[PDB]
């Protein structure tokens, strides 16, 4: 299963020019396009090697649509101020995300569409892709406008159509990179903090995709007390990192085991010191 | 591909 996402962000700046607009395009775990409103190019810029195969006609259409998005979301902010009766000299953030998920067959699986204003949900498309969910009364005014127009089936036509149709093209063009999984590299360290207490930190590096499960077990029993786990973090080269640490008494390190589960590993590895 | 977008 693979997915594609599109994220947009509009940040208002009173007196500092037009609001900053940043839009990015994401495959399941790989960014491939970008657009910055303050950049000199003012064009949809590629951020992946395989996406450069697209012809100039592709970039002309993509640039025109995203630039239309910035103007639409700039006009959107002024409407949001009067809808909520806010100060015209204040700064706010407008967010948006929607994409499509495909299956092993390349079949349509799920569709999403959500807007957000100042970190809270504003309007969202339901799972049926033909009805809306207004979070507050202000969004119901927009919902009424988006119900007078048949916006539901246009996004549904895109989500089941152009989104999926273009996603298979993106995967096929760069199957050498996106469709393959890099297995994690696993090792363990040792860090004593006193004469009878030590910290065992299980390391997993260079995996793709980023979804991975690390479980520290003691004598076959999972442990959460005295365990520190950090969120998955990107390496910048297309891989991700994650470690889990546990403080153990000295002389009992051989009892503890580390288990790492990942898609790239056919069998979940077991690591013991 | 980038989708269409509508105002409020």
């Amino acid at each position, epitope marked *: 299963s693979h997915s594609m996402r599109y994220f947009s962000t509009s940040v208002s700046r009173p007196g500092r020019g037009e609001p900053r607009f940043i839009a990015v395009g994401y495959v399941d775990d790989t960014q491939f396009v970008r657009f910055d409103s303050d950049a000199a190019s003012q064009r949809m810029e590629p951020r992946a090697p395989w996406i450069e195969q697209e012809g100039p006609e592709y970039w002309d259409e993509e640039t*025109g649509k995203v*630039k239309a998005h910035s103007q*639409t979301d700039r006009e959107n902010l002024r409407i949001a101020l009067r809808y909520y009766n806010q100060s015209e000299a204040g700064s706010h953030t407008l967010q948006m995300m929607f994409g499509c998920d495909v299956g092993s067959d390349g079949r349509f699986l799920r569709g999403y569409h959500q807007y957000a204003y100042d970190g809270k949900d504003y309007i969202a498309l339901k799972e049926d892709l033909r009805s809306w969910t207004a979070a507050d009364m202000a969004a119901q005014i927009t919902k009424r406008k988006w119900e007078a*127009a*048949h*916006v539901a089936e246009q996004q549904r*036509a*895109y989500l089941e159509g*152009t989104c999926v*149709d273009g996603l298979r093209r993106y995967l096929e063009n760069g199957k050498e990179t996106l469709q393959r999984t890099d297995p994690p590299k696993t090792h363990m360290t040792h860090h004593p903090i006193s004469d009878h207490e030590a910290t065992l930190r299980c390391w997993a590096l260079g995996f793709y995709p980023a979804e991975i499960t690390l479980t520290w077990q003691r004598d076959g029993e999972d442990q959460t007390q005295d365990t520190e786990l950090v969120e998955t973090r990107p390496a910048g080269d297309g891989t991700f990192q994650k470690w889990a640490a546990v403080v153990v008494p000295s002389g009992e390190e051989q009892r503890y085991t580390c288990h790492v589960q990942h898609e790239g590993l056919p069998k979940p590895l077991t690591l013991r010191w | 591909r980038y989708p269409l977008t509508f105002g409020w």
Partner: T-cell receptor
Amino acid sequence: QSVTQPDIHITVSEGASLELRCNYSYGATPYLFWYVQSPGQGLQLLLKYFSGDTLVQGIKGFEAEFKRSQSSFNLRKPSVHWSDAAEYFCAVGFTGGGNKLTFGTGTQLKVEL
Amino acid sequence: GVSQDPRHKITKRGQNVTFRCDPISEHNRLYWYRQTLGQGPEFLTYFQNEAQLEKSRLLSDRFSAERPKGSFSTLEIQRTEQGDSAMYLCASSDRDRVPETQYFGPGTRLLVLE
């Protein structure tokens, strides 16, 4: 892309059934339009469909039916008038590739009495 | 409902021409098309109320289109050649109607002569 109008020229007698076809590229759910253009002035919108409802009634007695299984949006008129002699274009909007319209090859129609 | 100006224009090759379009009120989008003699219209460029979003990459930089105040649009073509003789169409839409209907004006037919 690749909007195709098979009927490139039709000349019929007044009062006969009329059908002008229009096809798209087998995979889109696009905006559909039909425009008429007299030799002098510009285009006048007749019908539009994206909507939901297969069969659409437009101006000047023209009606169109959408068949997704066939990917066809064919103009129809029960009885053609003598004044309908003009070029008929069907316009499509491929929503994925922008909201610009992709016009057809054009059908030149004449009606004799 | 869209109004254009002028309807017919005759100019010599290698000079400057300029056309103006007055679309419907409260419509925020404007499309430019070029229709040759007895052929389908060709897309040129389109705006959303403030700026040029997309241009037909085939048409060179000498084709200048602008919608400064978001109400009327101007099209300027420099170094005219006989291959540019065609009808130029102006269309406007709402961007808030899902069918996204574009309404065209009477158009401007251009004749370029040596």
